Amino acid sequence: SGFSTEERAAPFSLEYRVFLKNEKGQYISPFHDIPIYADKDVFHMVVEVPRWSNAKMEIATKDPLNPIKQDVKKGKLRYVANLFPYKGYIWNYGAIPQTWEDPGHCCGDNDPIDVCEIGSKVCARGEIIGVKVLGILAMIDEGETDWKVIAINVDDPDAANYNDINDVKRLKPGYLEATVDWFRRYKVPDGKPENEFAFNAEFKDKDFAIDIIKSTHDHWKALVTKKTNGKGISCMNTTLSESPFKCDPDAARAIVDALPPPCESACTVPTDVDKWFHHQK
Amino acid sequence: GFSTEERAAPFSLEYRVFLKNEKGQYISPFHDIPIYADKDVFHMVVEVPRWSNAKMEIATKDPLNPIKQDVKKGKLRYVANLFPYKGYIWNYGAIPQTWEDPGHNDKHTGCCGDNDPIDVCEIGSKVCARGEIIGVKVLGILAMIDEGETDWKVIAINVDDPDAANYNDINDVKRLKPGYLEATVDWFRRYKVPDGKPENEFAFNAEFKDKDFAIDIIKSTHDHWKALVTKKTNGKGISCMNTTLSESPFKCDPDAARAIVDALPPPCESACTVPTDVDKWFHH
């Protein structure tokens, strides 16, 4: 185990918020307060969306304590289209904490580095896991570059057999190809055009991914130590001791409890979240 | 319209779903639902909702033919997730009052019958509930060869689906839902490969015959079913007990249906756990 969750309000409502708590029950920012490494050569990944889900959940980069909230497009909650034949998110999508794609130094998502866990277990939202990195894919998302790290849950029974991109090409054939297809097309059902890829849409190996993750971690270091412009990101955190933005545990308590309490009945998700979507090809 | 009486805990070994008509009297989904819902619209009993993994189906040999979970080798059986699909990529079910009479072969295949009602794949957007009764417009048929038997897979669409009007034959599917039929053929070809049995091949070279051919097959199976439910052909255990068919020897009064249902563990409030192995993929 390691971490726990504090949900606030009903899932899929506008005030639904997922906050992360350490072992001691103290609130923490998933974007700042979770050490990038779980053990040597194992990264923490905060899981934003479970595999085969449709809600677009993500770490609120600009809200205090960086809770996981549901993306909003024009006052209406965002869901991801079911791209035929896939059901929504075909991996556990999430972010590696303590990493920042600096929009300066576009070439910048200004979000944590986005991660695709490809193991068999479908993880829960807000669940913190360890992953061994396996590769990276360089997507250009509407004029900004958002890196997609390919990794696997270190506790998956076969995590030993996977150690670089070719093991994915080998033991789960077509997984990378469908990854590329999904990232290329996920914005087309809104009319908006396809997405491009650097390196001619090929997957770069593990060491290249780790170099990029280290780069984003240095960007994050500079960010959370006041050394580079905070550029709109809420940096409030409860653990970083060498940071100006550290705050007392009860500051986090007050920021959470000032929100609607956790709910019991679950909202009914619209029936359009079940429509397919095809392409002619 | 119709209602459901789920009995025992969902996904346990003794879980059974019975169907009730407008008045709460129980009926068999295999005998008592008219094949036609309206003119040229077929009733479909939904056995498994889209993107589910349990293999549920009408118990052809239990009394009143409830929907129960297939059991293969002492363990309740679920369907493996064929990459890139999540389980059933369509509302899978059966057309009632139809029987794939075994021993009787095919002018268009050679082999004999599923010994089930004719199997149906509904392709609308709405993901239907288990035991829910729907109306469908038939649109085509596929002929799978399963172990020396012909397994007919009818392709249809919910007649109440928001765009059900635009669909009237197989080419409308080829046009408005591209890649859907190809993935259908692939899916039926590859399941149970994660359980070792090899792939399945198809008559007509894995092609879909259009609607008139499908309706020929469906009317054929309905005639076989008539023969079954009027004792004209021996069922070999297929339960013909029913509460409405007036031309039937095996019809039984509503308190018989009451007694056969109430003789089961009552409805549940907790839920059994579906394994995380139901979430494992399977590739290539």
Contacts of B104 (CB under 8 A, 6+ apart): B112, B113, B224
Chain A: closest CA distance from residue B276 (Å): 6
Between the CA of residue A88 and those of A51, A239, B93, B102, B128, what are the distances in Å?
8, 35, 24, 41, 18
**Positive or negative CA dihedral for B56, B57, B61, B64?**
positive
Residue B82, both tokens: 């064929």
B276 in contact with chain A, both atoms CB, cutoff 8 A: yes
Q: Smallest Cα–Cα separation from A151: which of A173, A177, A180, A129?
A: A129
Elucidation technique: X-ray
Which amino acid, one-letter code, is at B274? V
Answer yes or no: do A175 and B283 touch at CB < 8 A.
yes
- B166 vs A contacts (CB less than 8 Å): none
What is the rounded end-to-end Cα distance, in angstroms, of chain B? 43
- Tokens for A34? 């979770």
SS3 letters for chain A? CCCEEEEEECCCCCCCEEEEECCCCCEECCCCCCCCEEECCEEEEEEEECCCCCECEEECCCCCCCCEEECEECCEECECCCCCCCCCCCCEEEEECCCCCCCCCCCCCCCCEEEEECCCCCCCCCCEEEEEEEEEEEEEECCEEEEEEEEEECCCCCHHHCCCHHHHHHHCCCHHHHHHHHHHHCCHHHCCCCCEEHHHCCCECHHHHHHHHHHHHHHHHHHHCCCCCCCCCCCCECCCCCCCCECCHHHHHHHHHCCCCECCCCCCCCHHHHCCCCCCC
Sign of CA dihedral B135, B138, B144, B148: positive
Number of A/B CB contacts below 8 angstroms equals: 60
- As given in the structure block, the two tokens for residue A217 are 């971690």
For residue A187, which phi and psi values (nearest 5 degrees)?
-95, -10
Do you find a cis peptide bond into B254, omega within 30 degrees of 0? Answer: no
HEC secondary structure over chain B: CCEEEEECCCCCCCCEEEEECCCCCEECCCCCCCCEEECCEEEEEEEECCCCCECEEECCCCCCCCEEECEECCEECECCCCCCCCCCCCEEEEECCCCCCCCCCCCCCCCEECCCCEEEEECCCCCCCCCCEEEEEEEEEEEEEECCEEEEEEEEEECCCCCHHHCCCHHHHHHHCCCHHHHHHHHHHHCCHHHCCCCCCEHHHCCCECHHHHHHHHHHHHHHHHHHHCCCCCCCCCCCCECCCCCCCCECCHHHHHHHHHCCCCCCCCCCCCCHHHCCCCCC
- Sequence-ordered list of residues with C-beta below 8 angstroms from that of B75, at least 6 positions apart, any chain: none
> Which amino acid, residue B21?
N
Which are the residues after which chain A is interrupted (C to N > 2.5 Å)? Answer: 105
Domain layout of chain B by residue ranges? 1-284
Query: Cα angle vertex B62, ends B61, B64, to 5°?
Result: 110
> Is B190:B181 a contact under the CB 8 Å cutoff?
no
Quick check: bond before B249 cis, omega within 30? no
Strands B133-146 and B149-158: antiparallel
B86 to A87: CB separation less than 8 angstroms, yes or no: yes
Which residues in chain A have their CB less than 8 angstroms from residue B83's CB? 172, 174-175, 178
Tell me how close the Cα of B64 comes to any Cα of chain A, in angstroms. 33
Dihedral pair phi/psi, residue B236, rounded to 5° = 50, 50
Question: At how many Å resolution was this determined?
Answer: 3.4
Closest to B153 in 3D by CA, of B125, B185, B180: B185
Which residue, among B248, B283, B274, B275, has the nearest Cα to B11 in the 3D structure? Answer: B274
Q: Between β-strands A27-28 and A17-21, what pairing exists: parallel, antiparallel or unpaired?
A: antiparallel
Tell me the CA distances in angstroms from A237 to A29, A224, B213, one per residue in order: 6, 9, 67
Q: Is B120 within 8 Å of B93 (Cβ atoms)?
A: yes
- Write out the binding residues of B for Mg(2+): 114, 119, 151
Q: Which residues of B are annotated as a binding site?
A: 114, 119, 151
What the block records as the tokens of B132 is: 């829910």
**CA–CA dist B67, B26 (Å, integer):** 13
Residues of B in contact with A274 (CB under 8 A): 50, 125-127
Find chain A residues with C-beta within 8 A of B125's C-beta.
271-272, 274-276
Strands B118-122 and B149-158: parallel
Instruction: Tell me, yes or no, if B11 comes closer than 8 A to chain A by beta carbon.
Output: no
A85 touching B (Cβ < 8 Å)? yes
Q: Which two tokens stand for residue A164?
A: 């670089």
To the nearest whole angstrom, how far is the Cα of B51 from the nearest Cα of chain A?
8
Contact of B51 with B265, CB cutoff 8 Å: no
Could you say which of A122, A178, A276 has the minimum Cβ distance to residue B279? A122
Partners of residue B184 in chain A, C-beta under 8 Å? none
Which residues lie across from B246 on neighbouring strands?
A: none
For Cα atoms A182, A184, A186, give the angle at the middle one, nearest 5 degrees: 60
DSSP bridge pairs for B136? B42, B158
- State the nearest Cα–Cα gap between B189 and chain A, in angstroms: 16
> CA nearest B56: which of B16, B96, B6, B102?
B16
In sequence order, what are the residues at sequence separation of 6 or more whose Cβ sits closer than 8 angstroms to the Cβ of residue A237? A28, A29, A32, A33, A224, A243, A245, A246, A247
Q: Give B68→chain A minimum CA distance, Å.
A: 26
Nearest to A6 by CA among A34, A28, A32: A28
To 5 degrees, how large is the angle CA B60–CA B64–CA B66?
65
* Whether B183 and A90 lie within 8 Å, measured CB to CB: no
* Cα separation, A53 vs B268, whole angstroms: 27
